[PDB]
Amino acid sequence: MKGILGVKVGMTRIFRDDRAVPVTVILAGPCPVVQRRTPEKDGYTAVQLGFLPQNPKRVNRPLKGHFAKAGVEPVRILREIRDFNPEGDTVTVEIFKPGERVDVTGTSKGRGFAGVMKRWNFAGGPDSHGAHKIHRHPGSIGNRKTPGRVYKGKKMAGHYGAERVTVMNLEVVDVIPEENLLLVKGAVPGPNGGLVIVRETKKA
């Protein structure tokens, strides 16, 4: 089950067969495997992947030990791809070909303390006809004496976004090995310059 780490760079649209396709560019390769997890040693199967070069000054001592055991230059982020064993010591964009269908994980844009209307799409209150300082309020949150409490899970205001979101089954439009570029069709979670993970889709 192949995967790769990357950065969201920006969107555009290209032309393919008199059709405009919205795309998102992701800079994916190259990612050196710096640990492998096995059923003996760890209980399961994964490949720990590294991404983006780091100023070795900024990498502390417990971390320096970890890279050296891999034969690997210091790296900004570590992330695993589960149930994955590439034969090489380095994973690149060459593992996805145009037409392939992928899933991408990103960290969503953060809307901070979000109101009930933005977060959960409540209807708010009326805007005239006597509506009184409730125009964006949630309304009732319960019943009366029975049950006489509020359910767990009840949708209310609170922080929104800045959370892990996966969007699935996106079409791979192109790959440009010469630039470690990956062109996926559609929209990817997070802001430009954001970290993402690209896996083979779990969709049939």
Partner 1 sequence: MKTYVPKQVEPRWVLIDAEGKTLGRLATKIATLLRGKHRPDWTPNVAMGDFVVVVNADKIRVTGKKLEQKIYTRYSGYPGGLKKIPLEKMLATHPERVLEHAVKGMLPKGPLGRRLFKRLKVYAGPDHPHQAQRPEKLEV
Partner RNA sequence: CGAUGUCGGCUCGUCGCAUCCUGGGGCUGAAGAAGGUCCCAAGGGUUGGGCUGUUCGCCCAUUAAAGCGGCACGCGAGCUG
Partner RNA sequence: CGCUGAAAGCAUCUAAGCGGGAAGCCCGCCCCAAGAUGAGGCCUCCCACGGCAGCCGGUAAGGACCCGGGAAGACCA
Binding site for partner 1 (CB under 8 A): 151-153
Site for Mg ion (CB under 5 A): how many residues? 20
**Strand 90-91 relative to strand 158-160, pairing:** unpaired
Q: Which of 76, 79, 101, 109 binds RNA (CB under 7 A)?
A: 109
Selection from 56, 43, 58, 157 nearest residue 111 by Cα: 157
Q: Which is nearer to RNA, 100 or 122 (CB)?
A: 122
Is residue 136 near RNA by the rule CB under 7 A? Answer: no
Q: Which is nearer to Mg ion, 134 or 168 (CB)?
A: 134
Q: Which stretch binds RNA (CB under 7 A): 13-21, 93-101, 142-150, 178-186?
A: 142-150
Q: Which of 14, 168, 176, 187 binds RNA (CB under 7 A)?
A: 168
How far apart, in whole angstroms, are the C-alpha atoms of residue 2 and residue 25?
Answer: 19
Rounded alpha-carbon distances, angstroms, from residue 61 to 66, 68, 70, 90, 186: 9, 11, 15, 24, 41
Neighbour tally for 122: CB within 10 Å: 17
| Strand extents, DSSP E, 83-180 | 90-91, 101-107, 112-114, 158-160, 164-176
Is residue 88 near Mg ion by the rule CB under 5 A? Answer: no
SS3 57: helix
Q: Which of 123, 141, 156, 176 binds Mg ion (CB under 5 A)?
A: 123
Is residue 76 near Mg ion by the rule CB under 5 A? Answer: no
Q: C-beta of 162: minimal distance to Mg ion in Å? A: 4
Is residue 110 near RNA by the rule CB under 7 A? Answer: yes
Q: Which stretch binds RNA (CB under 7 A): 23-31, 92-100, 107-115, 180-188?
A: 107-115
Rounded alpha-carbon distances, angstroms, from residue 55 to 9, 34, 58, 74: 22, 17, 6, 8
Q: Which of 80, 100, 136, 181 binds Mg ion (CB under 5 A)?
A: 136
H helices present in the chain, as ranges: 61-68, 116-120
Query: Residue 152 binds which entry of partner 1, RNA, Mg ion, none, with Cβ cut-offs from 5 to 8 Å by kind?
Result: partner 1
Q: Across-strand partners of 48?
A: 35, 80
**Which residues here bind RNA, judged by CB under 7 A?**
35, 37, 41-43, 60-66, 69, 103, 105, 109-113, 120, 122-126, 129-132, 134, 137-147, 151, 154-155, 159-166, 168, 190-193, 202
